């Protein structure tokens, strides 16, 4: 499952977390089995304007 | 005191049950000896612990 | 306040809409020990000290 968030919200991609992203956008289960991988994408997803 | 032998039995049984019931007031390391309080304050991830 | 002189605000006799806090995007750290702020909505307390 792939998507984009902002850095401060990466912590919310984890079991037992709350916040905007975890509550309304993407929710992992409390007993989540699997891996979360995240990397900065400023060079690809940012624009001067 | 003549019937002490019978009284003993009774008392012993009573003591056992009393301790049993009083053991419901212990934490055993939990944050509260009341199951409903733990459930009212914690979501599953750590409520289960 | 400076950390050595940290301020303490007593919160009492009021309704605490904790959602305003835990739904906000303004925080980078929001870490609750021994409680879930969502369940705080269903609880009453005698002492609150921000």
Which chains share the greatest interface? Answer: A-C, 5 and 8 residues
Strand content of chain A: under 5%
The strand count of chain A comes to 0
How far apart the termini of chain A lie comes to 29 Å
| Rg estimate of chain A, integer Å | 12 Å
Structural class by SSE content of chain A: mainly alpha
Q: Give me the strand/helix succession of chain A.
A: HH
Relevant terms:
part of a larger assembly, 3 chains, 49 residues, mainly alpha, Spike protein S1 (chain A)
Question: How would the blueprint of this fold be written?
Answer:
This is part of a larger assembly, with 3 copies of chain A.
Chain A: H1 20-25, H2 42-45
Commentary on this structure:
The PDB classes it as viral protein. The structure is cut from a larger assembly and holds three copies of chain A. The first copy, chain A, starts with 19 loop residues before the first helix and ends with a helix. Chain A has helices at residues 20-25, 42-45. The first copy, chain A, is built from two helices and no strands. Chain A is an all-alpha fold. Chains in contact: A-B, A-C, B-C. The B-C interface holds B 31, 40-43 and C 34-36, 38-39, 42-43.
Summarize the structure.
The structure is cut from a larger assembly and holds 3 copies of chain A. Chain A has 2 helices and no strands. With 49 residues, the first copy, chain A, is an all-alpha fold.
